[PDB]
Amino acid sequence: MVRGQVFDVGPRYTNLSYIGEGAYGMVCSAYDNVNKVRVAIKKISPFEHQTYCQRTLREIKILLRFRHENIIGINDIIRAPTIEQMKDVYIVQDLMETDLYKLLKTQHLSNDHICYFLYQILRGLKYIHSANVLHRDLKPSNLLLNTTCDLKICDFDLARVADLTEYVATRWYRAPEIMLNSKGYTKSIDIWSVGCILAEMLSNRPIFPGKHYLDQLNHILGILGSPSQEDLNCIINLKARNYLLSLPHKNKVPWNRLFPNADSKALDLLDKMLTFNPHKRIEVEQALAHPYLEQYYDPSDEPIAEAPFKFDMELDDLPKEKLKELIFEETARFQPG
């Protein structure tokens, strides 16, 4: 009934209106007749591909467990009664006004907003990482905003527990570790992404807008300068390691030459976040205590996960059918009754 595709969210959710696409697939805005508000609903049909089952079930479990002001929550999950009948899954979330991607492309951002937005991202991320969870795909389009400048992290489809070759809308916000296929990436990849986002909030333009795979590193090395052999510490691709050393020695561009009107405090933190070496990269807890965020910093009003995360089984090994059963049992909560 919407854009040709069927949307069986009624009778609770009515007044449908198309928003955009996934991630998983079609997303629409509907009026919740129960809670008397408008909500966002994602339609998911993951039962064909095996990876889609992983990403769907992983996001469900994580988000249902999480409970934070700066993280989107799942209000409801609509699916068919029986398991064979269930071919689609509908996730209901709070309808946010806009995102950081829409905002940055059109309108200029003041320092106080940039500072406030940065604090909320890290505050939310703190809760994430404290739960030993990696978002892995942070970006301006994954940061939703409302009327009162409240920020919420979204789209945990590519998330996992801290211990790929799939398609993505953008690779501009990925750490060099991912680019260099460094098996054993940690929480530092999220920090890098927030760094790229900080930079984009300042200049209203992407900091590392590479056209493709190799071009991404050229923009990074162009600004940060060439890396040492010590930076090449982790078990990375031997050829990629050699290729990096074979490239011409580029010089580091001072941040104030890139961001002249930017606050010196913000640039200081920006530096610590966008360091090539993953281990030398600042941690979220230390990033919040940074002088730039002292106006909002408050350890007493920054909740964490009561206990770190751990899934019962490894979903990477389970087949397409057992994952459906796992999804079926995880969504059993919202079924009446």
Swiss-Prot record:
DNA-binding region ranges: 239-257
One GO CC annotation: Golgi apparatus
Taxonomic superkingdom: Eukaryota
Outcome of swapping residue 42 to R: Does not inhibit interaction with MAP2K1
Short sequence motif TXY: positions: 165-167
GO molecular function, one term: RNA polymerase II CTD heptapeptide repeat kinase activity
Short sequence motif named Cytoplasmic retention motif, residue ranges: 298-302
Alphabetical keyword list: Acetylation, Apoptosis, ATP-binding, Cell cycle, Cell junction, Cytoplasm, Cytoskeleton, Disease variant, DNA-binding, Host-virus interaction, Kinase, Membrane, Nucleotide-binding, Nucleus, Phosphoprotein, Repressor, Serine/threonine-protein kinase, Transcription, Transcription regulation, Transferase, Ubl conjugation
Effect of residue 303 to R: In NS13; results in increased MAPK signaling; increased translocation to the nucleus; reduced interaction with DUSP6; no effect on interaction with MAP2K1
Keyword Ribosomal protein set for record: no
Quaternary structure annotation from Swiss-Prot or TrEMBL: Binds both upstream activators and downstream substrates in multimolecular complexes. This interaction inhibits its tyrosine-kinase activity. Interacts with ADAM15, ARHGEF2, ARRB2, DAPK1 (via death domain), HSF4, IER3, IPO7, NISCH, SGK1, and isoform 1 of NEK2. Interacts (via phosphorylated form) with TPR (via C-terminal region and phosphorylated form); the interaction requires dimerization of MAPK1/ERK2 and increases following EGF stimulation. Interacts with MAP2K1. Interacts with DUSP6.
Protein name (database record): Mitogen-activated protein kinase 1
Organism: Homo sapiens (Human)
Taxonomic lineage: Eukaryota, Metazoa, Chordata, Craniata, Vertebrata
Gene that this polypeptide is encoded by: MAPK1
